[PDB]
Amino acid sequence: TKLLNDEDQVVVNKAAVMVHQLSKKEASRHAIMRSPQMVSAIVRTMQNTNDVETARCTAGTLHNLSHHREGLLAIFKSGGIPALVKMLGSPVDSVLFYAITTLHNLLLHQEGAKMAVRLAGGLQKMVALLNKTNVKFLAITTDCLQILAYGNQESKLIILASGGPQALVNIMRTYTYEKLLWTTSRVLKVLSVCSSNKPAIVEAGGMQALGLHLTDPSQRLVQNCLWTLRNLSDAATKQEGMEGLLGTLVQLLGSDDINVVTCAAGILSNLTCNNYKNKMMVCQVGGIEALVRTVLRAGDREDITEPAICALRHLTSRHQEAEMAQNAVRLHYGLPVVVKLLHPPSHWPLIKATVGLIRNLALCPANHAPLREQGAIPRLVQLLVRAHQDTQREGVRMEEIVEGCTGALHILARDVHNRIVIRGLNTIPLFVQLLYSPIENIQRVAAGVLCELAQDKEAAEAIEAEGATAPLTELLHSRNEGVATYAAAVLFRMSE
């Protein structure tokens, strides 16, 4: 060794290519590993040289040392990790490749590495390199990152800072090389669990890109994509150009894999939230029928049934094709099972959702007869009363069930036939006393159904007998706009 090391002239660049090849021999590589100065000579050199054949080689050696435990440790303790990182700057693709593969080694096995990479800027650099074109290279890099980001939030915030979400989202959108799409999907998912990073990932096109890969053959990917999309699915109610994603999901509902059927269902429930296009997209690719079919095929499995009903709940209201969707549910035999889900062993969350869906289906007049003829009413009341005591005297506040069941009855009360049942289960004395409730949301619905019930003379009498003019009128100046309006309508309807 001796001579080699020393030199500060045209002399040492010659010395350079000279050691890269002893690194190849086993007891030679092993040899230099047991030297303190042999390593720190490559290091100082590799960074402070400017001959593109001197670097390529010094880097090359380190890569060869990085396979063994005393190989790695000697590298690390030789302050090489600061160096290896500046080499991530080198234009020479032969060095980029030496460095990023090396570091990967370092992070995977060596102790105190992740810190050193971070502290030296590693992250902000590794994120800059995602514009490179070599897939074999990216997939390694997007791993180093996943390594540095796992269970470390400072790091995930710095990859947000750098424009990572864009970079990675571009990859998902450009390449098809699995090992890459995979390691890159893993990172996305890891950042998918951050307050901030979520919207970023979304706005960059995260949703639309992940879903090019749902019908992929590799399952170790379609997973990641599904899960990841599920996380983000609540940030993503704002986006456009989903036509693709929606239509795909609506087809994975057919998947004879329970754990993919739930994710398909979960994710839709969210992307159908509030966004009036997403609803229409979903309806036209036959989504109503797909959901119903999925609900029947799921039975007592409430991880599937809960989401799917929320989704049907969403699609049955507040968009141009909702009347379509309310009929669709009737025509594809959804009514009988929707109702049967108000029965045990359904749990309240699910029962909460299902009443909401029934509230909506009831707006469609065709669904008045059909819903009546499945005893949706007698059952809604059952729950209403059970619930209106669990309060007077969880998993969900019973107030929500009381409001839910009276709203649903409100809507159903529109049909004169229904109106007759409703009254004849001795409900009226119970509607009137809901007025006196601390919750306005409850007073609003209560007064609503009364208003409808009270379009019949004999009922207006019945409703007046309960002394309903006492609190309708003290609500007549209620803080709540909806509360106060209905009060007028019932009072107006008993005087005619």
């Binding site: 090359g60 890569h63 290279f137 997939a139 390694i140 429930s269 969403h314 209201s317 507040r318």
Partner: peptide, 28 residues
């Protein structure tokens, strides 16, 4: 339609050897 057009929908909140060596020959 419905009284309640301004209503919101509730959202559920949810929560390489082969290529490394291959790359140092495309380096050599």
């Amino acid at each position: 339609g419905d009284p309640e057009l301004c209503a919101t929908d509730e959202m559920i909140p949810f929560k390489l050897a082969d290529i490394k060596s291959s790359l140092v020959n495309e380096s050599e």
